[PDB]
Design a protein around this ligand. Structure first.
Ligand SMILES: NC(=O)c1ccc[n+]([C@@H]2O[C@H](COP(=O)([O-])OP(=O)(O)OC[C@H]3O[C@@H](n4cnc5c(N)ncnc54)[C@H](O)[C@@H]3O)[C@@H](O)[C@H]2O)c1
Ligand SMILES: NC(=O)c1ccc[n+]([C@@H]2O[C@H](COP(=O)([O-])OP(=O)(O)OC[C@H]3O[C@@H](n4cnc5c(N)ncnc54)[C@H](O)[C@@H]3O)[C@@H](O)[C@H]2O)c1
Lengths: 418, 412
């Protein structure tokens, strides 16, 4: 048993380290010479706790070797990025999987297994991958095995997730399913959910679509509830008491790498039919503007100009931005000339970001909480003493503590100020 | 103690039967003399398993009396229908509730309790009910008590749910909450969820909105999946393996229900969801045409005319909407088979309905459809089923079975 991994990023690198730790002879392949040199030198390319340690032993074992050129293997894994095409429908860009596939093609031998771990649009495996392979003479389920196994990981111990998480084996043939089951069985303690390529592709993208549409509903309800002087949050809690009702929570928008990427892979496949998914996307995309307009309303009624943003990340307790509605709000609030913007975020390290809470809140006429950081769960009137007007507008409903001098506004209270 | 229920249908009648069964002197009111006469004669107006039996004893006890006119009571319960204001919004027509409110107004006395059990649009209790009452001289939380307690009925386990299910008492004042609690405490073993009128109103509507939007997603996926030659049903089952993913099932549309929208109307997602669910009858009709184009004949047998399975309600039914459309189509011969629907144009015998039919279209999830063999469909011209509710669980040999996940296989 020999294995190749094409694309050695947040997915590829840990996948290589996992198979090599488990005795498989692994070749790691990347377009980046920087990444290759850095790995050949003995250093990991991505920031992950204790991964550098597990890599060290693995590279010394001779079980992991990194090249820019693939070689004949028993199994090939494509873990390259899938960007959202600049276009109207934000189509899946399968362009990177296609060139990775091309690089694998000359080293293919009968009996081999190809795995696409990258997020792909429905019918990619069948209408794009399958043809290119079958054309060489190979026959899916006989000479070669095609599997889509969408790999997703939280930087909260990626290796742990690689072992224990439930996996979807989406093979082109029932044979491809067995071939892919054979491959992940080396370390997967989790369940091997058997299905065909198209279902595994559609299903994975459905998981993020159900989420996005259901957040779009909660966000839309917040807009309706605020105009009707109804507490959206109290309403969601009531209605959710029904076993068949699972209304999601509102927020400052929908960022995430997957959460905003994935629903667009479905739209682009049949744009005229995906009206609900599109609408869902528009509503979630409008939340930064809804928050900015509300922020503008608050500062007009009060004297002060300064507003302190609390949270710049897409998720709580992460130092990751890049895919954040919280950053989008800050950027917009800054651009507004009649608004003075002050940053505050304990997780990410940046130049324009203030790290002493008191100086950030100093003379501020609003605290716009945008991320659900655990540090925000407990906050007293003392933290906000330096403010011009002690008033918080929480969009993530993270503040659980009690206030006396501070005016607290949720997505369920904001109509009480306006 | 005297209680008055205005409207004796699927809600009002069981509510009357429950309070009377618990020793309250109940006065059932309905606008329909037929319903009044049948109840006075000793027969229930709605089809429900252990209900005619519990009514019999209750009527004999003298605890339940039915009139067309209300009278002074200690508590008034409005359980009239709330139709949809004809929109792609599906707002709440409160006119029947407002009608019922008028009919009770002259019998109001200080200390009384008014309960609106009907589904109402947000801020109804505050902007519509509250003013009309306060105008007479009454003061909410002092003279009289206004409560919105939206029901949730499950035909079959109706009376059982009436006792064990958790209830939302939505009072205009904290006093109104206590007043409504005194009433339901006579039989409610379940929890009394204390809240204000607007939250109780908005939540029932939200419960309905989550459902509609989530069905609109499953229906939209079916349209996408069929064009991509993917099985929607297999996809839903896979994705639902995730604990925080609960994709709903597709269907032949969504039957009439009030939504979390203010009638004054933006509400883009709820509107879109409504349009998609409203297009399902046409999608099914178009698919039916296609099936009939590839086969010979014109006959198609519609199996189910109701919005829900094991019910007789044809009101605002997508199954009825399909039948109506299929009839209107000149190149199509239509036949309706529903065991629960007592109507003139509806065929009683399954064999005569399927006789020379080129297609059998299942539109309702009736328990009788769960188990079906090739023998039932022997009289057909072409033995082929297009199930929209995925109710058929049984196995076939000569019959061609199609689902929302299979239709693309009929080579179209
Ligand atoms: N970020 C995640 O943990 C995550 C979560 C969900 C889904 N995914 C899916 O996996 C994909 C990859 O994510 P990632 O975080 O590993 O990306 P990444 O940027 O961290 O790594 C991609 C790597 O592939 C290399 N590469 C690109 N094209 C190549 C080619 N043609 N041949 C060889 N190497 C090539 C790049 O140099 C880079 O090192 C995502 O785009 C998405 O489809 C990832
Ligand atoms: N069908 C259900 O079990 C159900 C489920 C959810 C919500 N609801 C809510 O309850 C409402 C009623 O449902 P239902 O199934 O009982 O309807 P229904 O048609 O079975 O009964 C309504 C009864 O009220 C009577 N009526 C109408 N207007 C009246 C008036 N102004 N004065 C006196 N009587 C009047 C009618 O004659 C009829 O007998 C629904 O529209 C909805 O708001 C019902």
């Amino acid at each position: 048993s020999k294995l190749t991994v094409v694309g050695l990023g947040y997915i590829g690198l840990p996948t290589s380290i996992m198979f090599a730790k488990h005795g498989v002879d692994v070749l790691g392949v990347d377009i980046n010479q920087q990444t290759i040199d850095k790995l050949q030198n003995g250093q990991i390319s991505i920031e992950e706790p204790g991964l550098q340690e597990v890599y060290e032993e693995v590279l010394s074992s001779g079980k992991l070797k990194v090249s820019t050129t693939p070689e004949a293997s028993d199994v090939f894994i494509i873990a390259v990025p899938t960007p959202n095409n600049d276009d109207q429908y934000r189509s899946c860009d399968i362009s990177l999987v296609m060139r990775a596939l091309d690089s694998i093609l000359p080293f293919l031998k009968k009996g081999n297994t190809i795995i696409v771990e990258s997020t792909i649009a429905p019918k990619t495996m069948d209408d794009f991958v399958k043809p290119v392979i079958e054309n060489l003479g190979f026959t899916i389920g006989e000479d070669i095995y095609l599997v889509h196994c969408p790999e997703r990981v939280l930087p909260g111990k990626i290796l742990e997730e690689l072992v224990h998480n439930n996996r979807i084996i989406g093979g082109v043939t029932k044979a491809c399913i067995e071939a892919g089951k054979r491959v992940y069985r080396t370390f997967v303690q989790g369940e091997m959910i058997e299905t065909d390529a198209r279902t595994a592709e559609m299903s994975k993208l459905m998981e993020n679509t159900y989420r996005d549409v259901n957040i779009a509903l909660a966000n839309e309800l917040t807009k309706i509830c605020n105009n009707l002087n109804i507490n959206v949050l109290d309403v969601i809690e009531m209605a959710n008491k029904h076993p068949r009702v699972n209304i999601h929570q509102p927020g400052p928008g929908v960022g995430g790498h997957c959460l905003a990427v994935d629903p667009y892979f479905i739209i682009a496949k049949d744009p005229e039919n995906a009206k609900l998914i599109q609408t869902g996307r528009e509503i979630n995309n409008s939340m930064p503007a809804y928050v900015v307009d509300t922020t503008k309303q608050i500062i007009k009624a009060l004297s002060g100009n300064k507003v302190t943003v609390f949270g710049l990340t897409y998720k709580g307790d992460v130092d990751d931005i890049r895919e954040s509605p919280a950053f989008d709000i800050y950027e917009l609030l800054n651009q507004e000339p009649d608004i003075e913007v002050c940053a505050y975020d304990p997780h990410v390290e940046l130049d324009f970001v203030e790290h002493d809470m008191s100086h950030a809140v100093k003379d501020a006429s609003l605290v716009l909480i945008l991320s659900d950081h655990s540090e925000f769960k407990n906050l007293s009137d003392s933290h906000f003493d330096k403010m011009k007007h002690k008033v918080i507008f929480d969009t993530k409903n993270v503040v659980k503590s009690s206030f006396e001098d501070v005016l607290y506004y949720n997505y369920g209270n904001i109509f009480n100020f306006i």
